[PDB]
């Protein structure tokens, strides 16, 4: 799901970045680290709304090294998967255990055992495709996958989907 | 019965019977909670109720106060066909003869459905349901 | 005759099959019950009973 949440991050700056323009640098860092990365607590961070009204609060000096620590509160658009969530995706890589569906920035995997019996694996084709009794699952094909479980590891999120139930499969 | 309510859980009276016993309308078979939940949770497959082969679907269950499968099927089909026929040419003017004749036709259709005959007249009754639905849409 | 007298018609205690088997001469009713699978016996010995008054409370919570 594509949600919007106010996140807070502690930014560390080197003593060489204490110019009057340092605020800009903050925002710069606040982009370079937050946009594109991922967190196991809020999901894949997509974008960061409100770039002009970014609160800076007050910077504190930690003991050694002399680097500066900041607490920034902002608003960001993030993407977080959920268990048992119907999503759509396109296949990228194919495997004998199942094809790897691509849903946004997340690469969900579908186990072969979590597939109907009529859906069979075909390696003789290029690329290897899953041929069923009516639908042919190829790379560029669009498949509606129902996510059964999700894993929220730090800076790394992988989920498992299935298409065995009704109203699923290729789009 | 107190001796058959699930092929795996047929005697749960001394195990504190706190689980219900659902029945699928496409099987008419009693299955306890912990079993059917795994059944439709692992995929729409058939229940092993005395070697049953009819597929049990996900959800679409019902609570049963037990009035025999014959009367339960006759009241389910009775209500469904009663909703398909609706009130077409019933209280349109106040006639009693043609109204009772049409009710006799509807009840004869429900009778042919609960008896099945030879799987030939019931299909014509299904086409009659599609025709009546087409008349209700217009 | 002891082997032919099935189910507590003639009981004994098989000790060793090399010393004429020191026997035993008592009677009850069934005594066989070898239809009880060995797996059920292994699952019966692995159950650790809650001592003291914990067992009646654990049985009154289940409804027995
Ligand atoms: Zn059961
Ligand atoms: Zn059944």
UniProtKB/Swiss-Prot annotation, chain A:
GO MF annotation, one: single-stranded DNA binding
One GO process term, biological-process aspect: nuclear-transcribed mRNA catabolic process, deadenylation-dependent decay
Assembly and binders: Component of the RNA polymerase II (Pol II) complex consisting of 12 subunits. RPB4 and RPB7 form a subcomplex that protrudes from the 10-subunit Pol II core complex. The RPB4-RPB7 subcomplex probably associates with TFG1. Interacts with NRD1 and PAT1.
Record localization: Nucleus; Cytoplasm; Cytoplasm, P-body
Protein name (record): DNA-directed RNA polymerase II subunit RPB7
Described function: DNA-dependent RNA polymerase catalyzes the transcription of DNA into RNA using the four ribonucleoside triphosphates as substrates. Component of RNA polymerase II which synthesizes mRNA precursors and many functional non-coding RNAs. Pol II is the central component of the basal RNA polymerase II transcription machinery. It is composed of mobile elements that move relative to each other. RPB7 is part of a subcomplex with RPB4 that binds to a pocket formed by RPB1, RPB2 and RPB6 at the base of the clamp element.
Pfam families the UniProt entry points to: S1, SHS2_Rpb7-N
Keyword terms of this UniProt record: Cytoplasm, DNA-directed RNA polymerase, Nucleus, Transcription
Family recorded in the similarity comment: Belongs to the eukaryotic RPB7/RPC8 RNA polymerase subunit family.
InterPro entries: NA-bd_OB-fold, RNA_pol_Rpb7-like_N_sf, Rpb7-like, Rpb7-like_N, S1_domain
Something else known: Present with 6420 molecules/cell in log phase SD medium.
From Swiss-Prot, chain B:
Regions crossing the membrane: none
Compartment(s): Nucleus
Signal peptide: none
Note: Present with 3050 molecules/cell in log phase SD medium.
Disulphide-bonded residues: none
Coverage span on the entire protein: 8 to 145 of 321
Record-given protein name: RNA polymerase II transcription factor B subunit 3
Source organism phylogeny: Eukaryota, Fungi, Dikarya, Ascomycota, Saccharomycotina
Function: Acts as a component of the general transcription and DNA repair factor IIH (TFIIH or factor B), which is essential for both basal and activated transcription, and is involved in nucleotide excision repair (NER) of damaged DNA. TFIIH has CTD kinase and DNA-dependent ATPase activity, and is essential for polymerase II transcription in vitro.
Species in which this protein is naturally found: Saccharomyces cerevisiae (strain ATCC 204508 / S288c) (Baker's yeast)
Zn-finger (RING-type) residues: 6-53
Subunit structure: Component of the transcription factor IIH (TFIIH) holo but not the TFIIH core complex. Component of a complex consisting of KIN28, CCL1 and TFB3; the KIN28-CCL1 dimer is known as the TFIIK complex.
From Swiss-Prot, chain C:
Upper taxonomic lineage: Eukaryota, Fungi, Dikarya, Ascomycota, Saccharomycotina
Subcellular location(s) per record: Nucleus
Miscellaneous field: Present with 1150 molecules/cell in log phase SD medium.
Domain of life: Eukaryota
Known partners and oligomeric status: TFIIE is a tetramer of two alpha (TFA1) and two beta (TFA2) subunits.
UniProt protein name: Transcription initiation factor IIE subunit beta
UniProt organism field: Saccharomyces cerevisiae (strain ATCC 204508 / S288c) (Baker's yeast)
Family note: Belongs to the TFIIE beta subunit family.
Function according to Swiss-Prot or TrEMBL: Recruits TFIIH to the initiation complex and stimulates the RNA polymerase II C-terminal domain kinase and DNA-dependent ATPase activities of TFIIH. Both TFIIH and TFIIE are required for promoter clearance by RNA polymerase.
Transmembrane segments: none
């Amino acid at each position: 799901m594509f949600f919007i949440k106010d996140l807070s991050l502690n930014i560390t700056l080197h003593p060489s970045f204490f110019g009057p323009r340092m605020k800009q640098y903050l925002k710069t860092k606040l982009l370079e680290e937050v946009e594109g990365s991922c967190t196991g607590k809020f999901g894949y961070i997509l974008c960061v709304l409100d770039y002009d009204n970014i609160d800076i609060q007050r910077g504190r000096i930690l003991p050694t090294d002399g680097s500066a620590e900041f607490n920034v509160k902002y608003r960001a658009v993030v993407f977080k998967p959920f268990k048992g969530e119907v999503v759509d995706g396109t296949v990228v890589s194919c495997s004998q255990h199942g094809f790897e569906v691509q849903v946004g920035p997340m690469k969900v995997f579908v186990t072969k055992h979590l597939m109907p019996q009529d859906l069979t694996f075909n390696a003789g084709s290029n690329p290897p495709s899953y041929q069923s009794s009516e639908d042919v699952i190829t790379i560029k094909s669009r498949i509606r996958v129902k996510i059964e479980g999700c894993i929220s590891q730090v800076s790394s999120i992988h989920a498992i989907g299935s298409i065995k139930e009704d109203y699923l499969g290729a789009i | 019965e107190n001796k058959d309510m699930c092929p795996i859980c047929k005697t749960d009276r001394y195990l504190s019977p706190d689980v219900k016993f659902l029945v699928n309308p496409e099987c008419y078979h009693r299955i306890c909670e912990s079993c059917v939940d795994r059944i439709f949770s692992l995929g729409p497959a058939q229940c092993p109720y005395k070697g049953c082969d009819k597929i049990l679907r996900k959800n679409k269950f019902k609570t049963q106060i037990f009035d025999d499968v014959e009367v339960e099927k006759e009241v389910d089909i009775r209500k469904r066909v009663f909703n398909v026929f609706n009130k077409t040419i019933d209280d349109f003017n106040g006639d009693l003869v043609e109204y009772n004749k049409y009710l006799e036709e509807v009840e004869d259709i429900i009778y042919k459905l609960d008896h099945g005959i030879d799987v030939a007249k019931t299909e014509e009754k299904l086409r009659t349901y599609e025709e009546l639905n087409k008349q209700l849409i217009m | 005759t002891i082997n032919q007298l099935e189910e507590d018609s003639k009981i004994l205690v098989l000790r060793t099959k090399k010393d004429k088997t020191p026997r035993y001469v008592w009677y009850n009713s069934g005594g066989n019950l070898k239809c009880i699978d060995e797996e059920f016996v292994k699952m019966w010995e692995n159950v650790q009973l809650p001592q003291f008054a914990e067992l009646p409370r654990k049985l009154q919570d289940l409804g027995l």
